[PDB]
Design a protein around this nucleic acid. Structure first.
Lengths: 261, 207, 155
RNA sequence: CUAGUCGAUAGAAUAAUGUAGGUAAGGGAAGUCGGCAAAUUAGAUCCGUAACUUCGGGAUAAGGAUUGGCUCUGAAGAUUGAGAUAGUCGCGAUUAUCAAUUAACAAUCAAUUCAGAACUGGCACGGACUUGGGGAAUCCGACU
RNA sequence: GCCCGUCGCUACUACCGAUUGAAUUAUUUAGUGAGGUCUCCGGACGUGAUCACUGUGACGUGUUACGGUUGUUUCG
RNA sequence: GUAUGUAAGCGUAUUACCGGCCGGUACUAUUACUUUGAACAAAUUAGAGUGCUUAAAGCAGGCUUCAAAUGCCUGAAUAUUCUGUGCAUGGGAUAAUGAAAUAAGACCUCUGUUCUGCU
RNA sequence: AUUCUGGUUGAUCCUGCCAGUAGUUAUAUGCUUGUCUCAAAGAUUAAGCCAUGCAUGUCUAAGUACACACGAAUUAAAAGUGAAACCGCAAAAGGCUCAUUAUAUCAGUUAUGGUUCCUUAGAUCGUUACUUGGAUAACUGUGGUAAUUCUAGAGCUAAUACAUGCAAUUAAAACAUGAACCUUAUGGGACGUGUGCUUUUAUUAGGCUAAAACCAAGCGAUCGCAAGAUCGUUAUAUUGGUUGAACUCUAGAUAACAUGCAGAUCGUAUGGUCUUGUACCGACGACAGAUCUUUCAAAUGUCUGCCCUAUCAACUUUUGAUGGUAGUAUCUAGGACUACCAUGGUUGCAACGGGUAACGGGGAAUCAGGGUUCGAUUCCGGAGAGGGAGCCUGAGAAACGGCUACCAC
């Protein structure tokens, strides 16, 4: 573990998905080792300061979470740089906000508001259906939840709906070629639906051929694809317009046809 | 500070590799144990993160496995008789992994006469005619199920002649199977089938 | 070649002559457990009904075949249960716009299922744990096994 | 040890100078025509070896390490092979093929060399004996 | 007209060269070996119990409850 | 009128099956090269967006709000130095290798006239 | 902005250079200067030497208060303040430098089913003083010393520190063994116990086409009075992963082994319960501990890429070179090391030795392309704290704003 464990994070080392300022300050938040990864996690300091703009500096934000105002998934989460990863339900109850982390059309984070009943649940991919933990069967989700006693039919790379008020699973979806999906972390991150094919390469990285809503196709690996429902049927309210991955001309007309002109 | 890094070792073409990063902590090789045959002394050490290792040195006794039926009895290690690696690991009576050991043949005799109502080995009559108290613990017949089940048992009393000699002489050859420098125990298996045929070349025929 | 000849006794870790008490009598026709390396390669017959020990075989030893699968012509087979293969590739320079013949010789373990490997068979290999100082690989299939012109037509 | 001698004029005493042999603090050639004389080294195993050369040598160049005792281990060979298997006679007595065997196969027997390893003592170990100091040059004769 | 070496003088740069020359740097054979890690023993002072010290509380005075510049054999 | 650059039929493994010409399956001589992908930090560079008074920069910023601002968002793209190897996929020109000559031409096979069996 | 000009000659046309020209976050230096916006800045020479100054400490309602410093005192509340002093944590990140170092470091690519890891997270405790032991610092007091660097003796005193262990710590139950039983059989034990955790070894099934003929129990049932032979279906020849397979994971079983663990903690805010019995109970913890998982990592490993040099062509086993078996050590693979055994490995496709005014990369400079040149330097990886070596605490250091030698100063 030698010369470790590297407890800082400069700017220009942090992911550019945070859309951070490059000048201004010469460090990054260093997301503190929570249930999501480092680069896979939009830390609470970025969510509040940068793109909720509720607290303007690094001191105004620590007067908020230590006031125990925000909470994620019923847990208060007063660590001011908690990781707070993707598909999580950031429930700021005052004044009744109900945020979620969903990737952009362009794959970075966004701001997303949901309903209060939508704040009751969230979707999570499963990674491993190990057996031996409580009691005999066992299931560890993507986000670091160890849902003991799942359904036995749920094998790996499915997603379940966990109503986060409990730790129970209630709506599981099978990874199969009639299903909506979403990609977390490649060239195609932030593109939605509706997978046609997984090319099973034995050992390893069986890459998955996906076709979008508008008929275009792309491809990523199996660890990127995050299923979110059946064919054209999510279980979550999608962001601004739905990961369709517009052209490089389609920015230009929309910047002039949808502008004050 | 006996480092186990390969920044010695002239590389696979023969050429030398030069300097490399004076030494590192994560490559320490602590000295040996050399578990000799004495009074159960154990020193414990502190390792990579947190954990402890219990070094045997002058180890006494071990619980061995009767191989063909899986029964473990704590027993007295008499002495060593063989080692594949080095012959000073025979004479200096160092127990390591798989070095061949004479142990007892007594705590497997007494703990089998439930299943093995014909007791092995055949104990001697001219001075041990007194009974303290074997026939009462051989069967006693109980007029009941389990001594009747000893006729459903005792269809496994077909143990090899080679162990039948050692069980009569009361010195059974057992091969150690743990790393006593790294666990503080020597919990061997009794070699029965494939090795007792073998290793008596390596003891008897080498006289 | 070897009827279990070393001052240390040779046996496979995990199996035993267990004779009397067992759930049924699962003899498996012999007490010898073989794997299958299962990346598509057919598990060889001599690994299931064979008599070699080879603790470093992927089929019947303490190994798994992970990582990268590569190939190359065998070059010598002298050292005990290991061989020398020879890759060949083509490095390319920008400045001259022309390739270049190069070669790396990677030593690789060879379990005794492949008795009579001879230079130059085409073989197929795959990375495992570091086995001893050079050998980070294990043989998987002497695939062509065929000296093309100058090697294999007997005399 | 076998054989052979104690025959060298004998006793007392141990001054000087001697002939012959030892040792000597510290220094180490200052001594001297000149290291004369003396001193050092020396057997054996392993390492290692320079200038120059007629390529053969130089070379034991130089420069190092090891060695006793005791108790062990390993390597080097020889003659017999071992001889399964079926039955007889009455375990005795009696009658033979070969796949393999098979390295100190199983016996039996013999040799003294070589490699290790523990333990051990003014750490004195070629413990007497036997037994090269070495190197850089010049001049002469080639060499025996 | 051009042009070439020797020799002579002046100045400069490199060369070979007795001195087995000097100065240095890097590795390293052999020797002695600091300090440490490990480990066979060591076991200071101080310990729980104990033969036991005896007061009172107790018991039939002793011992303990309780304390001791208690000592001792005990034993860890 | 023609043109031809079009897909199919037809000198046939334009491939065994079930589905409504159509999904899903059963099912495949390589390599080099090439097409399209994945994978991989920013900063830099190439660069679209943006009147920092302009500019180098920056990643901000717009806005009937003219008299109330609630005033939505543009954003923070996009490809190249992260070359190269390596990994997917389309192609078969070029280019090497590969078969059937001291023996394999086959049989889709009821199939064994081997026997290894295996639940 | 894909460009050339003078220069050998009496004159000419050439090859050829030398000189011109130009850019350089590219360095010094000359002269020069009104505003301003950003701003590199002891890298090169000397990883040379350094005065002082500072650069690493830390508290909540909530682990410990007996501070007259006191807030307070008929709230002896003491929650204020708590200075101290334990404890707890961090001090292994920053920050610098570029001496080493040539497949080394590094880059991309892949592994760890060959490995450990503090913390944050999600499962995460019905297994006879009970809410115990003494002893300690701050504090008093007495001292030593050229030495503000340190520290002894004595008098006290606490714990989420130390050390021990029960009132539910509780077994029932589950369940085997022997066992109240008795009985012919996918039959039945009353009870003693054993039942945890982690450790270690061994044995066991370990990821699974279909019918009978036939037979041992003779099971429902059939022939039969039955025994007991025939056959015969359902539940029953029922453990996971990657699902690329002995992943030996904790799982599952069995035989056992040695050492500990198994909340004697804490307050905001108190209540239901008053039988006021202080019996019956709130949210809690920055709390604590065991296991699996997660995270931040880490160390190894893979294939490919790394300058000059043949006035370096052969190297590699003094005392590991390459491989085998077994071992030891490590967190772990491994000649990492020991033991025996094999004679292998490497190179003209540049091994090996040498050089370097060599940290590697991102990248920088410069032209139309092709390119040369540079990268000490802000980001990533690596190394080092005068030299070499050593090592404690720790989860993590072969640490140097830790110690231990020695050398130099």
């Amino acid at each position: 573990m030698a010369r470790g464990p590297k407890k800082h994070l400069k700017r220009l080392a942090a992911p550019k998905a945070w859309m951070l300022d490059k000048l201004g300050g010469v460090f990054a938040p260093r997301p503190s080792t929570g249930p999501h990864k480092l680069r896979e996690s939009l830390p609470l300091l970025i969510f509040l300061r940068n793109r909720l703009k509720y607290a303007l500096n690094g001191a105004e934000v620590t007067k908020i979470v230590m006031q125990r105002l925000v909470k994620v998934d019923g847990k208060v989460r007063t660590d001011p740089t908690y990781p707070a990863g993707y598909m999580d339900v950031i429930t700021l109850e005052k004044t009744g906000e109900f945020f979620r982390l969903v990737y952009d059309v362009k794959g970075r984070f966004v701001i997303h508001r949901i309903s209060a009943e939508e704040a009751k649940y969230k979707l999570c991919k499963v990674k491993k259906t190990q057996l031996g933990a409580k009691g005999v069967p066992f299931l560890v989700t993507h986000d670091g939840r160890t849902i003991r006693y799942p359904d036995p039919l749920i094998h790996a790379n499915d997603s379940v709906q966990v109503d986060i008020a409990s730790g129970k699973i209630t709506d599981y979806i099978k990874f199969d070629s009639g299903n909506l999906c979403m990609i977390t972390g490649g060239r195609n991150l932030g593109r939605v639906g509706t997978v046609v094919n997984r090319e099973r390469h034995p050992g390893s990285f069986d890459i998955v051929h996906i076709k979008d809503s508008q008929g275009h196709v792309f491809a990523t690996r199996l660890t990127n694809v995050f299923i979110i429902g059946k064919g054209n049927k999510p279980y979550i309210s999608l962001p601004k317009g739905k990961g369709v991955k517009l052209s490089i001309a389609e920015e230009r007309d929309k910047r002039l046809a949808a502008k004050t002109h | 500070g006996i480092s186990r890094d390969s920044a010695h070792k002239r590389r696979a073409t023969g050429g030398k590799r030069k300097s490399l990063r004076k030494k590192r902590k994560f490559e320490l090789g602590r000295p040996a144990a050399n578990t000799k045959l004495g009074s159960g002394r154990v020193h414990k050490v502190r390792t990579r993160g947190g954990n402890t290792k219990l070094r045997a040195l002058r180890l006494e006794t071990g619980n061995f496995a009767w191989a063909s039926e899986g029964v473990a009895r704590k027993t007295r290690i008499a002495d060593v008789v063989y080692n594949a690696s080095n012959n000073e690991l025979v004479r200096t009576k160092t127990l390591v992994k798989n070095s061949i050991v004479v142990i007892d043949a007594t705590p497997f005799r007494q703990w089998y006469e439930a299943h093995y109502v014909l007791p092995l080995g055949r104990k001697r009559n001219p001075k041990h005619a007194q009974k303290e108290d074997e026939n009462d613990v051989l069967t006693k017949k109980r007029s009941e199920k389990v001594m009747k089940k000893y006729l459903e048992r005792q269809k496994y009393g077909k143990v090899e002649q080679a162990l039948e000699d050692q069980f009569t002489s009361g010195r059974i050859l057992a091969c150690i199977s743990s790393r006593p420098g790294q666990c503080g125990r020597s919990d061997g298996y009794i070699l029965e089938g494939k090795e007792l045929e073998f290793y008596l070349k390596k003891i008897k025929s080498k006289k | 070649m070897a009827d279990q000849n070393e001052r240390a006794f040779q046996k496979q870790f995990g199996v035993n002559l267990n004779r009397k008490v067992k759930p049924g009598i699962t003899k498996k026709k012999l007490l010898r457990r073989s794997r299958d390396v299962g990346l598509g390669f057919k598990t060889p017959r001599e690994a299931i009904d064979g008599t070699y020990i080879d603790k470093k075989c992927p089929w019947t030893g303490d190994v798994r075949i992970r990582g990268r699968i590569l190939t190359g012509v065998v070059r010598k087979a002298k050292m005990q249960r290991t061989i020398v293969i020879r890759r060949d590739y083509l490095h390319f320079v920008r400045k001259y716009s022309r390739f270049e013949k190069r070669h790396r010789n990677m030593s690789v373990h060879c379990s005794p299922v492949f008795r009579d490997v001879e230079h130059g068979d085409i073989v197929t290999i795959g990375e495992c744990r570091p086995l001893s100082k050079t050998v980070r690989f294990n043989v998987l299939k002497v695939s062509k096994g065929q000296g093309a012109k100058k090697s294999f037509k007997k005399y």
